[PDB]
Design a protein around this ligand. Structure first.
Ligand SMILES: [Ca+2]
Length: 259
């Protein structure tokens, strides 16, 4: 069930010798708190600290501010359960030191195809700044950069309206988006909402992927979307949000060799 190796994060645990993905306790620097996390450890010696997972629609994501702060769902040795680690814990890990983390969003469609999108220098701010999302730049990935916003065509300024960098977190009971209405209440989730969204992984789990305006009384595009990879009417089958020290991603042809 729970492994004995501990560290500041899952990469620290992998560096110590851990070989199996599973449950481990981590103690982020300066927090004086220890908590369980699911580490995804591969053959390359990479250790990903997973903070979000969707795969079967078993966990209700319409939770309030406090629940999104503390975490909900379940952690399993097999990594086959849905959960949200908790905004407070995500903040503690991503800001524990001066070493930057990279966020990898892993997506899987209903046909078994998967894609990724990486963001460098990912951080989640303190509760005082409503767990604001900030990143330096999109680092690559075939899923596309939905966090930069997307032009759905229903407005020239769609891109500026759907960007996520710099947005505070919102829950139905703590609206911090840039919409006159309540993005979180309308979709029924917690997320870094703007004048809503281009990438939204905490949405409603729609079986089969395809859904439409007809699916909900008011016609909201509230599924698990990533506009740069699939249409807004296509909800993902699985999603994973996981972090790793950024230096782990610049280990290959991500460098200039000189002479
Ligand atoms: Ca609002």
């Amino acid at each position: 069930q729970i492994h004995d190796i501990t560290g500041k994060d899952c990469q620290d645990i992998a560096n110590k010798g851990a070989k199996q993905s599973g449950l481990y306790f981590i103690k982020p620097l300066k927090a004086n708190q220890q908590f369980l996390v699911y580490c995804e450890i591969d053959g390359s010696g990479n250790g990903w600290t997973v903070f979000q997972k969707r795969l079967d629609g078993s966990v209700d994501f319409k939770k309030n501010w406090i629940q999104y702060k503390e975490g909900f769902g379940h952690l399993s040795p097999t990594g086959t359960t849905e959960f949200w680690l908790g905004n407070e814990k995500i903040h503690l890990i991503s800001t524990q030191s001066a070493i930057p983390y990279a966020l990898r969003v892993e997506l899987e469609d209903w046909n078994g195809r998967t894609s990724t999108a990486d963001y460098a220098m990912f951080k989640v701010g303190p509760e005082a700044d409503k767990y604001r999302l900030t990143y330096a730049y999109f680092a690559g990935g075939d899923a596309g950069d939905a966090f930069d916003g997307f032009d759905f065509g229903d407005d020239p300024s769609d891109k500026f309206f759907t960007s996520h960098n710099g947005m505070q977190f919102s829950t139905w009971d703590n609206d911090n988006d840039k919409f006159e209405g309540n993005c979180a209440e309308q979709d029924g989730s917690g997320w870094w909402m703007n004048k809503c969204h281009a990438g939204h992984l905490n949405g409603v789990y729609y079986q089969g992927g395809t859904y439409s305006k007809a699916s909900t009384p008011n016609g909201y595009d509230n599924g698990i979307i990533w506009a740069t990879w699939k249409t807004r009417w296509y909800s993902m089958k699985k999603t994973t949000m996981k972090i790793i020290p950024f230096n782990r991603l610049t280990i290959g042809e991500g460098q200039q060799h000189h002479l």
